[PDB]
Amino acid sequence: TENFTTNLNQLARVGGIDPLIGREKELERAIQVLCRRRKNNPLLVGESGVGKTAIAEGLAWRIVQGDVPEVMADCTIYSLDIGSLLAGTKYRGDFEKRFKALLKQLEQDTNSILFIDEIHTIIGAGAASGGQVDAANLIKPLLSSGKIRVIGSTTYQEFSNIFEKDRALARRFQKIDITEPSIEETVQIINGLKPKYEAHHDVRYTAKAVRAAVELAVKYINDRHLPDKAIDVIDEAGARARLMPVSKRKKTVNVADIESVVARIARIPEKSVSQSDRDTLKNLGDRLKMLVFGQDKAIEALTEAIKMARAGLGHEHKPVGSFLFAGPTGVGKTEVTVQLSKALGIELLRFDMSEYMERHTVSRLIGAPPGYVGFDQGGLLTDAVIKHPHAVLLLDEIEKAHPDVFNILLQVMDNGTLTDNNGRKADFRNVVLVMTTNAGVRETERKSIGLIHQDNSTDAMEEIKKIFTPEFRNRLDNIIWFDHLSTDVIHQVVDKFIVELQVQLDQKGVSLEVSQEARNWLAEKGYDRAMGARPMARVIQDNLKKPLANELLFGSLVDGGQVTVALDKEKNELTYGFQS
Amino acid sequence: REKELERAIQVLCRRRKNNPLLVGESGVGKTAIAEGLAWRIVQGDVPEVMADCTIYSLDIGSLLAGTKYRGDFEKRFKALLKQLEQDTNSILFIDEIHTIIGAGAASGGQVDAANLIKPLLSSGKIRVIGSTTYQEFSNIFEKDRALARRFQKIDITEPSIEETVQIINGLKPKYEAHHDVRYTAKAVR
């Protein structure tokens, strides 16, 4: 019997159980339930991580210090190990002797209390051959009488679907609901536990560090309750500081350490950007201009949106940014997004809306098809964002998507989170949302039929307004209208493509140099307002890659490089010279 | 895998809930980190606090084979916990940890392997390392918020196309010895 039941009161003397701070209201009802004549068995029901076992163990702790009523004084609490009780019970009746022997001890003592953690397990603990003789059916007649006191602990899930199924057993237990404490209460809770964590890690926690752990955990750590989230941050900070520096070790735990810990847990940058990454953000816009020419309004919108978030001015419950990039083809709508992720060194989440044309396909984003019994039924968008909280979300050709897809984004842009059918909450507060559409190109390119030409400048927005409902557009941080590439910008584009060609040749050991005059000739051949910069690749392919390709396979370009390109004004044709 | 091991060593040093979890796609070195940690410990490449530490690789199938009784599973499983409780530094490596949530030896009952270890993991009595796929972690795991809370997710992703070459170089001697051949540098790349 001693092996199955662990005396919690004894552990309190040696320190084995953490102290209980607060929970006076919860305990008050528990003592009232325990002092009842019949069915004096409290049941602690609450979400995991909110100190349910701490209250049952805390009672044993408080008894040692004399912080309970006289009626509670002199009472011991026992914790039942179901596995130990069921072990070696192959023979008939073995489980019965151990369970009845335990009950006889409680009934005889008249002052002991049993604490069956995870009480949902005793429903069929002793069932054999589909037998109905179980721990619950045996204990039942001893609970209504009031001879024994039992303290339970079960989440709302397990309680509702397992414990509540047995109406008889559930009646005998009085559900004491435990709500996660407030931020003010959690800091007090950590202050009480802090001396134990400090001793384990041989470190000291500053008062400000404790407050940050609670406040930051609420903001950036989801699917975890507050008293558990903060302890997780506090525990990790002690572990990291203790073993990271072999020498030159900081005994104290500053606020910066807490910020770094939450960053690792949430896979998001911390608030120390003012020193380390200040250079990267300052040069973000400049670097994106070299890669993408023109369209500076889009670069400024993206970089400024990022700066505000890192500086602490970003929206509390909205993504870093939501920008609809609409314009002509080959203007950099889908290039600036791919380069932004590379500049920041963060995962790029690319979703092609061409697939999500129909209503039923939209369900894949937030779940799985109807009745998909097979596993891996998690939404592509929800699971992708959870894996990478810091990332760039690109929804190419959002106009093609079914109107029902805009309803999905309303909670993303305005509330910052999207929930899957299963219920997992995806956080979008730190992802940059960029959508690309060619909605207004047709209207702008349309030519009027009249004596006087019309200024079709606002027609693009009108088309955008029709395709996107006002609620969706309102949530957008800014709508950027990309414009056709100018002739001056094309020169920069030619240089960029040539640079990529040089990199490709560098792999084969060939070096290419082109004259400024030849660059200008290439620009005129490939400058098309409607097609932007994509035609430049075609002329680059036809003019340069074609001769080089033939020579590269067989000729001087096999090795040695030293290529030079020039043209004659009279001939008006490029000349390629290879000298190995 | 210094970044991955550093995060794991930090979790193992926690006062409570010092149970690392290795969540990653298939064949991305999830089990090599756990086994590799044992290899690194033997060679003295870990901190002094982690020295004198033994990793144990529990086999769930062996534990669930031959029970054929009401309490055979609990008898052997609990005995394992007693061993781990006795050795403060002992660590249990349970690959494919999603299986414990599934009834180990429970028929129409909820006395599973996961429930038995929930009190010990919360109290820091035993340290458990688990490896499971993202899809299994998202669907099989994380449903029971109780057990999920104890484990600390460590994302294990493929490092790069180039780092894999370095990895094969370290493994090349073992493979070369097995086949009595030498792999050219160009071939591995």
């Binding site: 192959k90 023979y91 008939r92 054999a128 051959s129 | 054929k68 009784y69 030896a105």
Partner: peptide
């Protein structure tokens, strides 16, 4: 799976 077992002593 869980089935009770009844034993018998030799004598």
């Amino acid at each position: 799976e869980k089935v009770r077992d009844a034993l018998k002593p030799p004598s």
